[PDB]
Amino acid sequence: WEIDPKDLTFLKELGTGQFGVVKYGKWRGQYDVAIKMIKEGSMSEDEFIEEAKVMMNLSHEKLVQLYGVCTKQRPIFIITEYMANGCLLNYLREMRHRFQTQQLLEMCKDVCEAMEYLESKQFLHRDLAARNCLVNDQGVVKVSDFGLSRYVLDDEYFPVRWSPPEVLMYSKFSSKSDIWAFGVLMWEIYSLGKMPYERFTNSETAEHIAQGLRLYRPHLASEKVYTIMYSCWHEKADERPTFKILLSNILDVMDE
Ligand SMILES: *CCC(=O)N1CC[C@@H]2[C@H]1C[C@]2(C)Oc1nc(-c2cnn(C)c2)cn2nccc12
Numbered sequence: 001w002e003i004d005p006k007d008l009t010f011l012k013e014l015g016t017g018q019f020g021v022v023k024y025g026k027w028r029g030q031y032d033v034a035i036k037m038i039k040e041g042s043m044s045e046d047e048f049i050e051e052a053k054v055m056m057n058l059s060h061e062k063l064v065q066l067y068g069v070c071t072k073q074r075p076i077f078i079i080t081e082y083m084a085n086g087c088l089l090n091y092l093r094e095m096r097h098r099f100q101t102q103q104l105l106e107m108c109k110d111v112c113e114a115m116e117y118l119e120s121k122q123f124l125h126r127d128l129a130a131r132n133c134l135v136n137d138q139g140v141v142k143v144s145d146f147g148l149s150r151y152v153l154d155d156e157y158f159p160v161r162w163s164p165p166e167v168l169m170y171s172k173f174s175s176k177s178d179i180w181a182f183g184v185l186m187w188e189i190y191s192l193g194k195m196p197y198e199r200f201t202n203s204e205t206a207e208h209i210a211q212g213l214r215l216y217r218p219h220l221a222s223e224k225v226y227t228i229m230y231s232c233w234h235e236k237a238d239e240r241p242t243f244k245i246l247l248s249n250i251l252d253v254m255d256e
Pocket residue numbers: 014015016017022034080081082083084085086087088089090130131132134
């Protein structure tokens with residue numbers, strides 16, 4: 001699970017994330033990698049290192065592969081697959097792409113395939129959103145930072161706009177909490193990176209979600225697509241669908 005830091009050649013800074021900067025680089029001077037440098041005091045480092053053994057055993061084509069960690073020094077490095085086209089939210093807000101509805105549905109399929117893998121492994125993301133998704137050189141969307149919310153040491157960390165009512169009121173996390181977030185993620189894609197509940201503050205959003213407010217139908221979304229995303233927002237969690245069911249629904253629409 002340990003990667004030698006010297007086998008990394010640092011090339012370009014990519015930006016900043018929740019735990020610090022991310023740099024582009026070569027591993028043994030041949031394979032592209034992303035090097036996440038974790039700011040000291042921002043991660044429960046002992047717990048993350050034990051969990052990394054589980055995360056490295058998660059292999060799926062639509063899951064951002066974790067190649068290993070560099071923990072012998074501080075700050076520690078997280079070495080992941082490189083995603084040439086960056087964060088999904090920024091990709092969606094780039095209007096030059098002139099996206100077709102089918103491309104948006106493929107992004108939804110990509111995430112749904114990855115989340116079905118995780119559901120099969122009993123692994124919860126706990127923060128599914130377009131900001132935690134990355135896009136590669138071929139337009140493939142992949143899910144990133146799955147489960148990392150459990151190791152953030154900042155108290156103010158909360159993703160209210162992606163949270164079902166039982167989480168906002170009781171902190172009851174489950175597979176159904178990820179399902180709700182996926183419904184919001186579909187809305188984000190069909191709204192081209194629009195913030196969920198754009199007219200409300202984080203406090204008003206939860207107040208309205210308790211009263212029963214639901215996201216509206218994005219302009220680029222058909223009735224059938226909206227139906228899939230609205231299914232993720234049933235007030236009773238037990239009534240929300242499985243990632244297996246959502247994938248079958250997306251493939252049905254993709255074929256039609
Ligand atoms: C939407 C949230 C966001 O802006 N980020 C979360 C992850 C970090 C930023 C994007 C960054 C810096 O991580 C990565 N960025 C790229 C990237 C950005 N621009 N180009 C041309 C590439 C590529 N990555 N591969 C893995 C992680 C990142």
